[PDB]
Coordinates of C-alpha atoms and ligand atoms in Angstrom, one line a residue:
Chain A
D1 CA 97.9 86.1 101.8
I2 CA 98.4 89.3 104.3
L3 CA 101.5 88.4 106.8
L4 CA 100.6 90.0 110.4
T5 CA 103.6 89.8 112.2
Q6 CA 104.1 90.5 115.0
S7 CA 107.2 91.2 117.8
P8 CA 108.5 90.8 120.2
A9 CA 107.5 87.5 120.4
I10 CA 107.4 88.2 124.5
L11 CA 107.4 91.7 126.4
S12 CA 108.8 91.9 129.7
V13 CA 106.8 94.9 132.1
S14 CA 106.7 95.8 135.5
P15 CA 103.5 95.9 137.7
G16 CA 101.3 99.5 136.7
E17 CA 103.9 100.0 133.7
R18 CA 102.0 100.8 130.0
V19 CA 102.5 98.1 127.4
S20 CA 102.4 98.2 124.1
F21 CA 102.8 95.2 121.4
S22 CA 103.4 96.0 117.9
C23 CA 101.6 94.4 114.6
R24 CA 102.5 95.3 111.1
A25 CA 101.1 94.0 107.7
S26 CA 102.4 93.1 104.8
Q27 CA 100.4 95.9 103.2
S28 CA 98.0 98.3 104.0
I29 CA 94.5 96.8 105.0
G30 CA 93.1 100.3 106.4
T31 CA 91.6 100.0 110.1
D32 CA 90.8 95.9 109.6
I33 CA 93.2 95.2 111.8
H34 CA 91.1 93.5 115.4
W35 CA 92.8 91.9 119.0
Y36 CA 92.5 89.3 121.0
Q37 CA 93.8 87.7 123.6
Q38 CA 94.2 84.3 125.2
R39 CA 94.8 83.2 128.7
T40 CA 96.3 79.9 129.2
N41 CA 94.1 77.3 128.4
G42 CA 91.6 79.8 127.5
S43 CA 89.6 80.3 124.4
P44 CA 90.5 83.5 122.8
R45 CA 88.6 86.5 123.8
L46 CA 88.1 89.8 121.2
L47 CA 89.8 92.8 122.9
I48 CA 89.3 95.3 120.5
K49 CA 87.5 95.6 117.0
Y50 CA 88.5 97.8 114.2
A51 CA 92.1 98.5 115.8
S52 CA 90.7 101.0 118.0
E53 CA 86.9 100.5 118.8
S54 CA 86.1 99.4 122.3
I55 CA 84.4 95.7 122.9
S56 CA 81.9 95.6 126.1
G57 CA 83.3 94.1 128.9
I58 CA 87.1 95.2 128.1
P59 CA 89.0 96.9 130.7
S60 CA 89.3 100.7 129.6
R61 CA 92.6 99.3 130.2
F62 CA 92.9 98.5 127.1
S63 CA 93.0 100.7 123.7
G64 CA 94.8 100.2 120.5
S65 CA 95.8 102.7 117.5
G66 CA 97.3 102.7 114.1
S67 CA 96.1 102.4 110.4
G68 CA 97.4 101.2 107.1
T69 CA 100.5 98.7 108.1
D70 CA 101.2 99.4 111.5
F71 CA 99.0 98.9 114.4
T72 CA 99.5 99.2 118.3
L73 CA 97.2 97.2 121.0
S74 CA 98.0 98.8 124.1
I75 CA 97.5 98.3 128.0
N76 CA 97.7 101.3 130.3
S77 CA 99.1 99.9 133.7
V78 CA 99.7 96.1 133.5
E79 CA 98.9 93.6 136.0
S80 CA 98.8 89.8 136.6
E81 CA 95.5 89.3 135.3
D82 CA 96.7 90.7 131.4
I83 CA 99.2 88.0 131.7
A84 CA 98.4 85.9 127.9
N85 CA 98.5 85.9 124.6
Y86 CA 98.0 88.6 122.2
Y87 CA 96.9 88.0 118.2
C88 CA 96.5 90.4 115.6
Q89 CA 93.9 89.6 113.0
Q90 CA 93.2 91.2 110.0
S91 CA 90.0 91.3 107.7
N92 CA 91.1 93.8 105.0
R93 CA 91.5 90.9 102.5
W94 CA 90.4 87.3 102.0
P95 CA 91.0 84.7 103.4
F96 CA 91.6 86.1 107.2
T97 CA 95.0 85.9 108.5
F98 CA 96.5 85.9 112.2
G99 CA 99.3 87.2 113.7
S100 CA 102.2 85.0 115.6
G101 CA 101.2 86.5 118.4
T102 CA 103.2 88.3 121.6
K103 CA 103.8 86.8 125.6
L104 CA 102.4 89.5 128.2
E105 CA 105.4 89.0 130.9
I106 CA 105.2 90.8 134.3
Chain B
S1 CA 47.7 107.6 91.4
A2 CA 49.6 108.5 88.2
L3 CA 51.5 105.9 86.3
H4 CA 54.5 107.9 86.1
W5 CA 54.5 108.7 89.8
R6 CA 54.0 104.8 90.7
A7 CA 56.6 103.9 88.3
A8 CA 59.9 106.2 90.0
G9 CA 57.6 105.0 93.4
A10 CA 57.8 101.1 92.5
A11 CA 61.5 102.0 90.7
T12 CA 62.8 103.1 94.3
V13 CA 61.4 100.9 96.6
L14 CA 63.2 98.2 94.0
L15 CA 66.5 99.8 93.6
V16 CA 66.8 99.4 97.3
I17 CA 65.9 95.0 97.2
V18 CA 68.5 95.1 94.3
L19 CA 71.2 96.9 96.9
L20 CA 70.4 94.7 99.8
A21 CA 70.6 91.8 97.8
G22 CA 73.3 93.1 96.1
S23 CA 75.5 93.5 99.0
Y24 CA 74.7 90.2 100.3
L25 CA 75.6 88.5 97.3
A26 CA 78.6 90.7 96.0
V27 CA 79.9 89.1 100.3
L28 CA 78.8 85.8 98.9
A29 CA 80.4 85.5 95.5
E30 CA 83.9 87.5 96.7
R31 CA 84.8 85.0 99.8
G32 CA 86.5 82.7 98.5
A33 CA 89.3 85.2 95.9
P34 CA 92.9 85.8 97.4
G35 CA 92.8 89.2 97.9
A36 CA 89.4 90.0 97.3
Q37 CA 88.3 92.9 99.5
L38 CA 84.1 93.0 98.5
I39 CA 83.8 90.4 101.5
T40 CA 81.7 92.1 104.8
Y41 CA 78.0 93.4 104.4
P42 CA 78.3 97.0 105.9
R43 CA 81.2 97.9 103.0
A44 CA 79.8 96.0 100.7
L45 CA 76.6 98.2 100.8
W46 CA 78.5 101.1 100.5
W47 CA 79.6 99.1 97.2
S48 CA 76.7 98.7 95.9
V49 CA 75.5 102.1 96.5
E50 CA 78.7 103.9 95.2
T51 CA 77.6 101.2 92.0
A52 CA 74.0 101.3 91.4
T53 CA 74.8 105.4 91.3
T54 CA 77.1 104.5 88.9
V55 CA 80.6 106.5 90.6
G56 CA 82.6 103.5 92.5
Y57 CA 85.4 105.1 93.3
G58 CA 87.4 102.3 93.2
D59 CA 88.0 101.8 96.9
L60 CA 85.9 98.5 96.0
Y61 CA 85.5 96.3 93.5
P62 CA 84.2 92.5 92.9
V63 CA 87.1 90.5 91.0
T64 CA 85.6 87.2 90.6
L65 CA 82.6 85.8 87.5
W66 CA 79.6 86.0 89.9
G67 CA 81.0 89.1 91.8
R68 CA 80.7 91.1 88.6
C69 CA 77.7 89.8 87.5
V70 CA 76.0 91.4 90.6
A71 CA 78.0 94.3 89.9
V72 CA 76.0 94.4 86.4
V73 CA 73.0 94.1 87.9
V74 CA 73.1 96.6 90.5
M75 CA 74.6 99.0 87.9
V76 CA 72.2 98.5 85.3
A77 CA 69.2 98.7 88.2
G78 CA 71.0 101.5 89.4
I79 CA 71.2 103.0 85.4
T80 CA 68.1 101.8 85.0
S81 CA 65.9 103.5 87.9
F82 CA 67.0 107.0 87.8
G83 CA 66.3 107.6 84.3
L84 CA 63.1 106.6 84.9
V85 CA 62.7 109.0 87.4
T86 CA 64.3 111.6 84.7
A87 CA 61.5 110.2 82.3
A88 CA 58.3 110.3 84.8
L89 CA 59.7 114.2 85.8
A90 CA 59.2 114.8 82.0
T91 CA 56.0 113.3 82.1
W92 CA 55.3 116.1 84.9
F93 CA 56.7 119.1 82.5
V94 CA 55.6 118.0 79.6
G95 CA 52.1 118.1 81.1
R96 CA 51.9 121.0 82.9
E97 CA 53.4 122.6 79.7
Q98 CA 50.1 122.0 77.6
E99 CA 48.1 123.3 80.4
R100 CA 49.9 126.6 81.1
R101 CA 49.0 126.6 77.1
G102 CA 45.4 126.2 78.2
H103 CA 45.2 122.7 76.8
Chain C
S1 CA 55.3 97.6 67.0
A2 CA 55.7 100.8 68.9
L3 CA 58.8 102.7 67.4
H4 CA 60.6 103.5 70.8
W5 CA 59.5 99.7 72.1
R6 CA 61.8 98.4 69.0
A7 CA 64.6 101.3 69.3
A8 CA 64.7 100.3 73.4
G9 CA 64.9 96.7 71.4
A10 CA 67.2 97.5 68.7
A11 CA 69.1 99.6 71.2
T12 CA 70.4 96.8 74.2
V13 CA 71.2 94.2 71.3
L14 CA 73.3 96.3 69.2
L15 CA 74.5 97.4 73.0
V16 CA 75.7 93.8 73.1
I17 CA 77.4 93.7 70.0
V18 CA 79.5 96.2 70.7
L19 CA 80.3 94.7 74.5
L20 CA 81.6 91.7 72.9
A21 CA 83.5 93.7 69.9
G22 CA 85.1 95.9 72.6
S23 CA 86.3 93.1 74.9
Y24 CA 87.8 91.6 71.1
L25 CA 89.7 94.7 69.7
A26 CA 90.4 96.3 73.1
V27 CA 92.6 93.1 73.8
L28 CA 94.3 93.8 70.0
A29 CA 95.0 97.1 70.9
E30 CA 96.8 96.4 74.5
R31 CA 98.4 93.4 73.2
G32 CA 102.1 95.0 73.1
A33 CA 101.4 97.8 75.5
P34 CA 104.4 97.2 78.6
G35 CA 102.4 97.5 81.6
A36 CA 99.0 97.0 79.9
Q37 CA 96.7 94.6 81.8
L38 CA 93.3 95.6 79.7
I39 CA 94.9 92.0 77.8
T40 CA 92.8 89.0 78.2
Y41 CA 89.5 88.6 76.9
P42 CA 87.5 87.7 80.0
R43 CA 88.4 90.1 81.7
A44 CA 88.5 92.6 78.5
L45 CA 85.1 92.4 78.7
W46 CA 83.8 93.2 81.9
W47 CA 86.0 96.1 81.4
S48 CA 83.7 97.0 79.3
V49 CA 81.2 96.1 81.0
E50 CA 81.9 98.9 83.6
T51 CA 83.0 101.0 81.1
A52 CA 79.6 100.7 78.4
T53 CA 77.5 101.0 82.1
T54 CA 79.9 104.3 82.8
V55 CA 81.3 102.9 86.4
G56 CA 85.1 101.8 85.8
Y57 CA 86.9 101.6 88.5
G58 CA 90.5 102.1 86.8
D59 CA 91.1 97.9 88.1
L60 CA 91.5 98.1 84.3
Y61 CA 91.9 101.0 81.9
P62 CA 93.5 101.1 77.9
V63 CA 97.0 102.5 77.3
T64 CA 96.7 102.4 74.2
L65 CA 95.7 105.0 72.0
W66 CA 93.7 102.1 69.7
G67 CA 92.3 100.9 72.7
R68 CA 91.4 103.7 74.3
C69 CA 89.4 104.7 70.5
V70 CA 87.2 101.3 71.7
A71 CA 86.7 102.9 75.1
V72 CA 85.5 105.6 73.6
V73 CA 83.3 103.7 71.4
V74 CA 82.2 101.4 74.2
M75 CA 81.8 105.0 76.9
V76 CA 80.0 106.5 74.3
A77 CA 77.6 103.7 73.2
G78 CA 76.9 102.2 76.6
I79 CA 75.5 105.7 77.4
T80 CA 73.3 106.2 74.2
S81 CA 71.3 103.2 75.0
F82 CA 70.5 103.4 78.7
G83 CA 69.4 107.0 77.6
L84 CA 67.3 105.6 75.0
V85 CA 65.7 103.3 77.1
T86 CA 65.0 106.4 79.2
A87 CA 63.9 108.3 76.2
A88 CA 62.0 105.3 75.2
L89 CA 60.5 105.1 78.8
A90 CA 59.1 108.9 79.1
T91 CA 57.2 108.1 75.3
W92 CA 55.6 105.6 77.3
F93 CA 54.7 107.5 80.4
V94 CA 53.5 111.1 78.4
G95 CA 51.4 108.5 76.2
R96 CA 50.0 106.8 79.0
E97 CA 48.8 110.1 80.4
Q98 CA 47.3 111.5 77.7
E99 CA 44.8 108.5 78.0
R100 CA 44.5 108.8 81.2
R101 CA 43.5 112.7 80.9
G102 CA 40.6 111.2 78.4
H103 CA 42.4 112.2 75.1
Chain D
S1 CA 57.9 131.8 84.4
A2 CA 57.6 127.9 82.6
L3 CA 57.4 126.2 85.7
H4 CA 60.0 122.9 83.9
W5 CA 63.1 126.1 83.3
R6 CA 62.1 126.8 87.3
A7 CA 62.7 123.6 87.9
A8 CA 65.5 123.4 86.0
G9 CA 66.7 126.7 88.0
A10 CA 66.0 125.6 91.3
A11 CA 67.6 122.6 90.3
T12 CA 71.4 124.3 90.3
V13 CA 70.9 126.4 93.6
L14 CA 69.7 122.9 95.6
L15 CA 72.6 121.4 94.2
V16 CA 75.1 124.2 94.8
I17 CA 73.8 123.9 98.2
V18 CA 74.3 120.1 98.1
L19 CA 77.6 120.8 97.2
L20 CA 78.8 123.2 99.8
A21 CA 77.4 121.4 103.3
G22 CA 78.2 117.9 101.6
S23 CA 81.9 119.5 101.3
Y24 CA 80.9 120.6 105.0
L25 CA 79.8 117.8 106.8
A26 CA 82.0 115.0 105.1
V27 CA 85.4 117.0 106.6
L28 CA 83.5 116.7 109.4
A29 CA 82.2 113.0 109.0
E30 CA 85.8 111.6 107.9
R31 CA 88.6 113.7 110.8
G32 CA 89.2 110.9 113.4
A33 CA 89.4 107.9 111.1
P34 CA 92.5 106.7 111.0
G35 CA 94.5 107.4 107.4
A36 CA 91.0 109.2 106.5
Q37 CA 92.3 111.6 103.1
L38 CA 88.6 113.4 102.8
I39 CA 90.1 116.0 105.5
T40 CA 90.2 119.9 104.7
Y41 CA 87.4 122.0 102.8
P42 CA 89.5 122.6 99.9
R43 CA 89.4 119.2 98.7
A44 CA 86.1 118.3 100.5
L45 CA 84.7 120.3 98.2
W46 CA 86.2 118.8 94.8
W47 CA 85.5 115.4 95.9
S48 CA 81.9 116.8 96.0
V49 CA 82.2 118.1 92.7
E50 CA 83.3 115.2 90.5
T51 CA 81.0 113.3 93.3
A52 CA 77.4 115.0 92.1
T53 CA 78.3 114.5 88.2
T54 CA 79.4 110.7 89.4
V55 CA 83.1 110.6 87.5
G56 CA 84.8 110.2 91.2
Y57 CA 88.2 109.9 90.1
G58 CA 89.1 107.8 93.2
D59 CA 91.2 109.9 94.3
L60 CA 89.5 111.3 97.5
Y61 CA 86.5 109.2 99.3
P62 CA 84.7 108.7 102.6
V63 CA 85.4 105.6 104.5
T64 CA 83.5 106.4 107.7
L65 CA 79.6 105.3 107.7
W66 CA 78.2 109.3 108.0
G67 CA 81.2 110.5 105.6
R68 CA 79.7 107.8 102.5
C69 CA 75.9 108.4 103.3
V70 CA 76.5 112.6 103.0
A71 CA 78.3 110.5 99.7
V72 CA 74.9 109.1 99.3
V73 CA 73.0 112.2 99.2
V74 CA 75.4 114.1 97.2
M75 CA 75.4 111.9 94.6
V76 CA 71.8 111.6 94.2
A77 CA 71.1 115.0 94.2
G78 CA 74.2 115.8 91.6
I79 CA 72.0 113.0 89.5
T80 CA 68.8 113.6 90.1
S81 CA 69.4 117.5 89.4
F82 CA 71.0 116.9 85.3
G83 CA 68.0 114.4 85.0
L84 CA 65.8 117.4 85.4
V85 CA 67.6 119.5 83.5
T86 CA 67.4 116.7 80.5
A87 CA 64.2 116.0 81.6
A88 CA 63.3 120.3 80.8
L89 CA 65.0 120.1 78.1
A90 CA 63.1 117.3 76.3
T91 CA 59.6 119.2 77.3
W92 CA 61.4 122.2 75.7
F93 CA 62.0 120.1 72.4
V94 CA 58.4 118.0 72.8
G95 CA 56.3 121.6 72.9
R96 CA 58.5 123.5 70.0
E97 CA 57.8 120.5 67.7
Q98 CA 54.4 121.0 68.0
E99 CA 54.5 124.4 67.1
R100 CA 56.7 123.5 63.7
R101 CA 53.7 120.8 63.5
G102 CA 51.6 124.1 62.9
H103 CA 48.9 122.7 66.2
Chain E
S1 CA 65.3 121.7 60.5
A2 CA 63.8 119.9 63.5
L3 CA 65.4 121.9 66.3
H4 CA 65.7 119.0 68.7
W5 CA 67.8 117.6 66.2
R6 CA 70.0 121.0 65.7
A7 CA 70.3 121.0 69.7
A8 CA 71.8 117.1 69.7
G9 CA 73.6 118.3 66.3
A10 CA 75.3 121.6 68.0
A11 CA 75.5 119.8 70.7
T12 CA 78.3 117.5 69.3
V13 CA 80.0 120.2 68.3
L14 CA 80.5 122.2 71.2
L15 CA 81.3 119.0 72.9
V16 CA 84.2 118.4 70.3
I17 CA 85.4 122.0 71.7
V18 CA 85.1 121.5 75.0
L19 CA 87.0 118.6 74.6
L20 CA 89.9 120.1 73.3
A21 CA 90.4 123.4 74.5
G22 CA 90.2 121.1 78.1
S23 CA 92.4 119.2 77.3
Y24 CA 94.8 122.4 76.1
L25 CA 94.2 124.1 79.4
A26 CA 94.2 121.3 81.8
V27 CA 98.0 121.3 80.7
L28 CA 98.7 124.4 80.8
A29 CA 96.8 124.4 84.2
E30 CA 98.5 121.5 85.7
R31 CA 102.1 121.8 84.7
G32 CA 104.2 123.9 87.5
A33 CA 102.3 120.9 90.0
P34 CA 104.3 118.4 91.4
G35 CA 103.5 115.7 91.1
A36 CA 101.0 116.1 88.5
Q37 CA 100.3 113.9 85.8
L38 CA 97.8 115.9 83.4
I39 CA 100.5 117.0 81.9
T40 CA 100.6 116.1 78.1
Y41 CA 98.0 116.8 75.7
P42 CA 97.4 113.7 74.1
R43 CA 96.9 112.0 77.5
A44 CA 95.4 115.3 79.0
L45 CA 92.8 114.7 75.7
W46 CA 92.2 110.8 76.8
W47 CA 91.4 112.3 80.5
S48 CA 88.9 114.6 79.4
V49 CA 87.2 112.1 76.8
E50 CA 86.7 109.6 79.8
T51 CA 85.9 112.7 82.2
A52 CA 82.6 114.1 79.6
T53 CA 81.5 110.8 79.2
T54 CA 81.8 110.3 83.4
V55 CA 83.8 107.5 83.1
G56 CA 86.8 109.1 85.0
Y57 CA 89.0 105.7 85.8
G58 CA 91.3 107.6 87.8
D59 CA 94.6 107.3 86.0
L60 CA 95.0 111.0 85.5
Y61 CA 92.9 113.5 87.3
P62 CA 93.6 117.4 87.6
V63 CA 95.5 118.5 91.4
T64 CA 95.2 122.2 90.4
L65 CA 92.6 124.0 91.0
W66 CA 92.1 125.8 87.8
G67 CA 92.9 122.3 86.3
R68 CA 89.8 120.9 88.7
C69 CA 88.0 124.0 87.1
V70 CA 88.1 122.8 83.7
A71 CA 87.4 119.5 84.8
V72 CA 84.1 121.0 86.3
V73 CA 83.5 122.3 83.0
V74 CA 84.5 119.1 81.1
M75 CA 82.2 117.0 83.1
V76 CA 79.1 119.4 82.7
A77 CA 79.6 119.8 79.3
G78 CA 80.0 115.9 78.8
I79 CA 76.8 115.4 81.1
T80 CA 75.1 117.6 79.3
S81 CA 75.2 117.1 76.1
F82 CA 74.7 113.4 76.0
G83 CA 71.3 114.2 78.3
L84 CA 70.4 116.5 75.4
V85 CA 70.3 114.2 72.7
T86 CA 68.2 111.9 75.4
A87 CA 66.3 114.7 75.1
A88 CA 66.3 115.0 71.5
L89 CA 65.4 111.2 71.3
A90 CA 61.9 111.4 73.4
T91 CA 61.1 114.1 71.1
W92 CA 61.7 111.8 68.4
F93 CA 59.6 109.0 69.7
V94 CA 56.8 110.9 71.7
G95 CA 56.1 112.5 68.1
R96 CA 56.4 109.3 66.4
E97 CA 54.1 107.8 68.9
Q98 CA 50.9 110.5 68.0
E99 CA 51.4 109.4 64.5
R100 CA 50.7 105.6 65.0
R101 CA 48.2 107.5 67.1
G102 CA 46.4 108.8 64.1
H103 CA 46.9 112.1 65.3
Chain F
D1 CA 99.3 107.4 111.0
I2 CA 102.2 109.4 109.0
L3 CA 105.7 108.8 109.9
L4 CA 107.9 111.9 109.4
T5 CA 111.3 111.2 109.7
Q6 CA 113.9 114.6 109.7
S7 CA 117.3 113.5 109.4
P8 CA 120.5 114.3 110.3
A9 CA 118.4 116.3 113.6
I10 CA 121.6 118.8 113.7
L11 CA 123.3 120.7 110.7
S12 CA 126.3 122.5 111.1
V13 CA 126.7 125.4 108.6
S14 CA 128.2 128.8 107.8
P15 CA 127.5 132.1 107.5
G16 CA 125.6 132.8 104.3
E17 CA 125.5 129.4 103.1
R18 CA 122.8 127.6 101.7
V19 CA 121.1 124.8 103.8
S20 CA 119.2 122.5 103.1
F21 CA 117.0 120.1 105.9
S22 CA 115.3 117.0 105.3
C23 CA 111.8 115.7 105.9
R24 CA 110.3 112.0 104.2
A25 CA 107.2 110.3 104.5
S26 CA 106.0 106.9 105.0
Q27 CA 104.3 107.4 102.3
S28 CA 103.1 109.5 99.7
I29 CA 100.8 112.8 101.2
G30 CA 101.8 114.6 98.0
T31 CA 101.8 118.6 98.4
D32 CA 100.5 118.6 102.0
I33 CA 103.6 119.3 103.9
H34 CA 104.1 122.2 105.2
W35 CA 107.0 123.9 107.9
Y36 CA 107.8 125.7 111.2
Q37 CA 110.2 127.1 113.0
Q38 CA 110.9 127.0 116.5
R39 CA 113.5 129.5 117.8
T40 CA 114.6 128.8 122.0
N41 CA 111.4 129.9 124.0
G42 CA 109.1 130.6 121.1
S43 CA 105.9 129.5 120.2
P44 CA 105.9 127.7 116.5
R45 CA 105.7 130.2 113.1
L46 CA 104.7 128.5 110.1
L47 CA 107.7 129.3 107.6
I48 CA 106.3 127.3 104.2
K49 CA 102.9 126.0 103.6
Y50 CA 101.6 123.1 101.1
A51 CA 105.6 122.5 100.7
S52 CA 106.4 125.1 98.1
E53 CA 103.7 128.0 98.9
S54 CA 105.6 130.8 100.4
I55 CA 103.3 132.5 103.0
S56 CA 103.6 136.6 103.8
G57 CA 106.2 138.6 106.3
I58 CA 108.6 135.6 106.0
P59 CA 111.8 136.0 104.0
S60 CA 112.3 135.2 100.2
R61 CA 115.1 133.3 102.0
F62 CA 113.0 130.8 102.9
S63 CA 112.1 127.6 100.0
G64 CA 110.9 124.7 99.8
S65 CA 110.0 122.0 97.2
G66 CA 109.8 118.3 96.8
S67 CA 106.2 116.3 96.6
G68 CA 105.1 112.3 97.2
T69 CA 107.4 111.2 100.6
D70 CA 110.7 113.6 99.8
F71 CA 110.4 116.6 100.9
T72 CA 113.3 120.2 101.4
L73 CA 113.3 123.4 103.5
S74 CA 115.5 125.3 102.5
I75 CA 117.3 127.9 103.3
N76 CA 120.0 130.2 100.7
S77 CA 122.3 131.8 102.7
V78 CA 121.8 131.2 106.3
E79 CA 122.8 133.8 109.4
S80 CA 121.9 133.8 113.5
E81 CA 118.3 134.7 113.2
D82 CA 118.1 131.4 111.6
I83 CA 119.2 129.5 114.7
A84 CA 116.4 127.4 115.3
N85 CA 114.5 123.8 115.5
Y86 CA 112.7 122.9 112.2
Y87 CA 109.9 120.6 111.7
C88 CA 107.5 119.8 109.3
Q89 CA 104.1 118.3 108.9
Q90 CA 101.8 117.1 107.2
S91 CA 98.2 116.7 106.6
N92 CA 97.5 114.3 103.9
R93 CA 95.3 111.9 105.9
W94 CA 94.0 112.0 109.6
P95 CA 95.5 112.6 112.3
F96 CA 98.4 115.5 111.0
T97 CA 101.7 114.3 112.4
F98 CA 105.0 116.4 113.1
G99 CA 108.5 115.6 112.1
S100 CA 111.0 114.7 115.2
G101 CA 112.3 117.8 114.1
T102 CA 115.9 119.3 112.6
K103 CA 118.0 122.3 114.9
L104 CA 120.2 124.7 112.5
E105 CA 123.6 125.4 113.6
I106 CA 126.3 128.2 112.7
Ligands
TBA201 C1 77.2 112.0 80.9 C2 76.9 111.8 82.4 C3 76.7 109.8 82.0 C4 76.4 109.1 83.2 N1 74.5 109.3 83.6 C5 74.4 110.5 84.1 C6 74.8 111.3 85.3 C7 74.4 112.5 86.1 C8 75.4 113.2 87.0 C9 74.7 108.1 85.0 C10 73.6 108.0 85.9 C11 73.5 107.6 87.1 C12 73.0 106.6 87.6 C13 74.0 108.5 82.8 C14 74.2 107.3 82.8 C15 75.4 106.4 81.6 C16 75.4 105.3 80.8
K202 K1 79.2 107.6 85.9
K203 K1 82.4 107.0 87.1
K204 K1 88.1 105.3 89.9
K205 K1 84.9 106.2 88.8

């Protein structure tokens, strides 16, 4: 089973600044990585698919890059509404797995 | 119409059906097998196309017994078919040759 | 019955025999070779099927001289056979064509 | 001249065209896909040759949908063609056999 | 003797020559290319057999331009040949069919 | 995306001596590595292609070796005109990437 390491656990940043959360795979998973955002007491919300493909309804502020073992979710100018938990999840190999998660902090 | 043409004709449609059900069943067979990659329809379909055409880069392959079974069927349908087009292409030539031979 | 059909017919049975003895001998040839993976009957059999059908994903392959020899034989039987079905499929078409040509 | 020969004849030229446009389009389709390797004309061309001839070592392969599509076309042209040479080679034999049969 | 049989006959001998010179030239082409593995006659020969028979597990493959060229030739000879046996096998059937048809 | 580590950043050497800059790939890239030289306020200048193939117009002093993950650019007898930045760049996998660069110092 694949391991999705997400460190740091928390990330401090100031308004409008650019933030980037890191997610590492225990082995090449290509581009089969997807991002989810979860706000306090919310349900997860698909943010990005296949590491760099955008989803409709998601701020153009949200972007992603990476391939193989090192992937990056990026917010280009943070802001209050962005405060949440961010998780990565691979579907390269069965069974799917989730990242330990990373908390945004403005 | 000309049998060998209906054949090649059929042959193609049928293959397309095997390719699809192949992709579908493959995913079904593979999911559940740790480390398996043949697990999402889209690639599973490209898996089947490279397999029928007998290329198969090894980018993806079944690791379960049922997954493989599907592989054997996709493989066999893939081969058989193209070989049928060939066969049919031969009847065509052999026939038009006679004609040019005034017979 | 129609030769070309007995052929394809035979051809299949024979292959199934080569596939089996292939799997059996392959394991026998490979065991003993450090880093070898072609070493348990079950997969060895799927190894032979992907090999006869000429696909071979590279998930498994012989690394010993005798292992390879078996590979060459499985490969050759695999090819030859299917090609025989093709050939036989062609006689079928070429013949039924004449008929439609009133000859 | 003999149709089956013009065919095999054509068949070859055409393939060479598919091989080239294949290499060209493949690079075009792949570039942009992270981790993609099918991204420089030269190897892309050797990629197409190993693919048409259905070998494909897995040293290189498309990972994009359009890249694959090109693959399917290269694969199919590759197969079809050689099979056409075969077919044509058969008309040749079948014909020269009649002659030796005094007909 | 029967042309199509001399052909398949020839076809085989010739292949064996291509397989050998292939192995020999491949090593010659590859040595000198960092990271190259197609560099000792013995495996180079098994490389050629898996390549002619179009299987090619990807355990070994050329990375030089001349190495590949040899690959393309081995590939093509491999294909062509077997297809010739097929073709020849078809003349055989088509002919013995006529006989059973009392013609 | 591939990482091209180039360390040290600087390299001290004496006239005529033989110098060798190291460039490491985050994963096998075969021979798909190429060298560029950039002098103060200049444009990059292809030095080597495919790790060991020479380019016309480049001092026979310039050589290169390596394959897989460890590559080496070598100057056989340095000299003033050689003072510059040296970068490696792979084209094994999309998207191309550049090395952090290494400064020569006589
Ligand atoms: C020496 C060629 C052997 C491979 N063939 C022919 C490919 C011609 C590019 C693959 C057919 C494609 C379904 C025949 C199947 C043999 C089992
Ligand atoms: K094949
Ligand atoms: K193959
Ligand atoms: K392979
Ligand atoms: K293969």
